[PDB]
Amino acid sequence: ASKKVHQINVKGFFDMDVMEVTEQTKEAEYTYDFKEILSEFNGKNVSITVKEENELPVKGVE
Amino acid sequence: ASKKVHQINVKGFFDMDVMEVTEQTKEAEYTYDFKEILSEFNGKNVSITVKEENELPVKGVE
Amino acid sequence: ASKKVHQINVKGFFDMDVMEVTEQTKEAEYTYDFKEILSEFNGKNVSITVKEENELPVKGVE
Amino acid sequence: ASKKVHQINVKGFFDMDVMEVTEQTKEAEYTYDFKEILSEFNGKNVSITVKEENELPVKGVE
Amino acid sequence: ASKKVHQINVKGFFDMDVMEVTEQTKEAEYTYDFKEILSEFNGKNVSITVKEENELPVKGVE
Amino acid sequence: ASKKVHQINVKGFFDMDVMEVTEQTKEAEYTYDFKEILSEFNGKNVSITVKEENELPVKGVE
Amino acid sequence: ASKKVHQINVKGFFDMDVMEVTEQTKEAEYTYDFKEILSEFNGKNVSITVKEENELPVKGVE
Amino acid sequence: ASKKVHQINVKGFFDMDVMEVTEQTKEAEYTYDFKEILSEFNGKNVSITVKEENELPVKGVE
């Protein structure tokens, strides 16, 4: 069960055209290039997760 | 706190050149194209996780 | 193990008569119709969870 | 933080027309009526979760 | 896997002599009697967890 | 955030009269006396959890 | 499944030369000696986790 | 929230004298040297977790 784990978490607005993820913090607006990140993993067994969560359509605010 | 979550989990051998992930099950060897999967999210806020876990270098076996 | 997950979380005061869940936010009072939400899943395999948590009967506040 | 939690987990094939969830066990096929279950919570604050997970579209099995 | 779970969480200062647990909130000091709570479960299969966490002995402060 | 945690997990059939918990393993049938266990914590802030999970009333096996 | 767990969590700047971990709280600067802590476990089956998390190299701060 | 995580998990019999952890798998007996592992983190903010879990003292085996 012993193992070495290496993981990258990236949260932000995704633009696959320029292949970049950019998050709007409370101070700035950071931009990470998913391409470079992804490449660090090219050639190996990985576990990739892509989550997108939105709001629930309401039917009435009071 | 109510929300609608949509998530994709993909585990397998990653080849970013052809942009495909392929896992070796006990029964068959499935191949998913990360490109198509990724595109379903292009243009929205996301969390991407990319995990890669290996074994620990030993020094004694018996 | 690769898969596509789609999940809906709804937290609020439940009224099964009108089939609606409504949560009280420190800014407003949203109302979601559990019927419409539930219907998005009609006809498929699902894990459903319904939690209700209350307070513990005390034997002395101070 | 002390509290009393009461929760119901139901996993199966969902039919909202007859309002029943039915899971296929390697020993039998159980059927629960979501209506009765849901009613045990009518009139209270609740967190409800509805998950539906499917497979990932492949581009080549082998 | 479908099931009905019923759980009690109780956090506070424990006195087994009078069999009572009492927590000091920011607003008030609640007192729950572990005896009554425990009895609700007498006669059934359970999981009991009892956790106690303290601070780590330091050796340098600045 | 550094801390020392000490925790006890006890799963089995609960009998508060003789104050003992007894689990039926695959080999034997172990019996732990909740009294002794509980006492190790008498006099300190703790987080106690008592869970009891049962099966869901069915309406039809096929 | 019943068991007694004993666990130590230590978060801070690690210096293996003097074998000490030191975290910078919003108040003080605590220093724990990993040596003493580690010794409390010498001679036992353990599980050890060492995590180090950094920031993601950006390409566009704004 | 985006970040790079690097984590090591080590489970086995701990000997701090020789500074080695050794686990007994269902096949072999692997030995890892905690010293080398630990050094990979010397000089960094880390989180360290050391857990040791034992069995509960019974009062009636059967």
Instruction: Please give, one letter per residue, the 3-state secondary structure of D1-58.
Output: CCEEEEEEEEEEEEECCCCEEEEECCCCEEEEEHHHHHHCCCCCEEEEEEEEEECCCC
Residue B27 structure tokens: 């029964």
Contact C41, D10 (CB under 8 A): no
Rounded to a whole number, what is the distance in Å from the CA of E43 to chain F's nearest CA?
5
Contact G32, E61 (CB under 8 A): no
User: Which helix (H) or strand (E) is B38 found in, with range?
Assistant: helix B34-39
Calpha distance D34→D40 (Å, rounded): 10
Domains, chain E, with CATH or none: 1-62 (6.20.120.10)
- Interface contact G43-H5, CB threshold 8 A: no
- Distances in whole angstroms, Cα of residue F38 to Cα of each of A34, F21, F32, G2, G35: 52, 12, 11, 14, 31
The structure's method of determination equals X-ray
Contact G31, G22 (CB under 8 A): yes
- Interface contact A3-H23, CB threshold 8 A: no
Q: Most A CBs within 10 Å: which of C31, C36, C40, as the mutation test of the A interface? A: C31
SS3 G49: strand
Cα B36–B39–B43 angle (5° rounding)? 175
Calpha distance E4→F11 (Å, rounded): 17
Three state DSSP letters for chain F: CCEEEEEEEEEEEEECCCCEEEECCCCCCEEECHHHHHHCCCCCEEEEEEEEEEECCCCCCC
Calpha distance E17→D57 (Å, rounded): 61
Query: Residue B5: closest CA among chain C residues belongs to which residue?
Result: C7
How many whole angstroms from its chain centre is CA B11? 4
- Interface contact G37-E56, CB threshold 8 A: yes
SS3 H16: coil
Query: Residue F58: closest CA among chain D residues belongs to which residue?
Result: D32
Rounded to a whole number, what is the distance in Å from the CA of H45 to chain F's nearest CA?
13
Give the one of A10, A28, A32 whose C-beta lies nearest to G59's C-beta: A32
A37-61 in b/e burial notation, b at 16+ Cβ within 10 A? bbeebeeebbbbbbbbeeebeeeee
Closest by Cα among F40, F43, F54 to E50: F40
Query: Residue E8: closest CA among chain C residues belongs to which residue?
Result: C56
Beta bridge partners of residue H6, listed in sequence order: A6, G52
Calpha distance D32→F27 (Å, rounded): 34
Contacts of D11 in chain E (CB under 8 A): 1-2
Calpha distance H21→H33 (Å, rounded): 6
SS3 B22: strand
Tell me the H-state helices in chain E: 34-39
Query: Residue H4: closest CA among chain A residues belongs to which residue?
Result: A8
SS3 C16: coil
List all residues 6 or more positions away from D51 whose beta carbon is below 8 Å from its beta carbon.
Answer: C5, C6, C7, C8, C46, C47, C48, C49
- D38 contact E CB<8A: no
List all residues 6 or more positions away from H27 whose beta carbon is below 8 Å from its beta carbon.
Answer: none
CA dihedral E34, E38, E40, E46 (to 10 degrees): 150
SS3 C48: strand
Closest by Cα among A19, A51, F58 to B4: A51
- Interface contact A11-H1, CB threshold 8 A: yes
The distance in angstroms from the start CA to the end CA of chain B is 53
Calpha distance B47→B27 (Å, rounded): 31
Could you give phi then psi for residue G39, rounded to 5 degrees? -65, -25
Calpha distance B34→A10 (Å, rounded): 16
Calpha distance C1→B51 (Å, rounded): 14
**What would you measure as the largest C-alpha separation in chain G, in angstroms?**
53
Contacts of A8 in chain G (CB under 8 A): 56
Calpha distance D14→D10 (Å, rounded): 10
- Distances in whole angstroms, Cα of residue E7 to Cα of each of A46, C55, D49: 37, 12, 18
Structure letter (DSSP) for residue E25: -
Closest by Cα among E45, D17, D36 to C50: D36
SS3 G36: helix
Calpha distance A52→A55 (Å, rounded): 10
Rounded to a whole number, what is the distance in Å from the CA of G43 to chain H's nearest CA?
5
C24-49 in b/e burial notation, b at 16+ Cβ within 10 A? eeeeeebbbbbeebbeebeeebbbbb
- A30 contact G CB<8A: yes
CB atoms within 10 A of CB D55: 10
Contacts of C60 in chain E (CB under 8 A): 30-31
Calpha distance B46→A49 (Å, rounded): 10
List all residues 6 or more positions away from A46 whose beta carbon is below 8 Å from its beta carbon.
Answer: B11, B12, B14, B21, B50, B51, B52
- E23 contact C CB<8A: no
Tell me the H-state helices in C1-62: 34-39
Give the one of F2, F12, F23 whose C-beta lies nearest to G23's C-beta: F2
- Interface contact F58-D29, CB threshold 8 A: no
A12: left (phi over 0), alpha (psi -120 to 50) or beta: left
How many whole angstroms from its chain centre is CA D48? 10
- Interface contact A58-C8, CB threshold 8 A: no
**What would you measure as the largest C-alpha separation in chain H, in angstroms?**
53
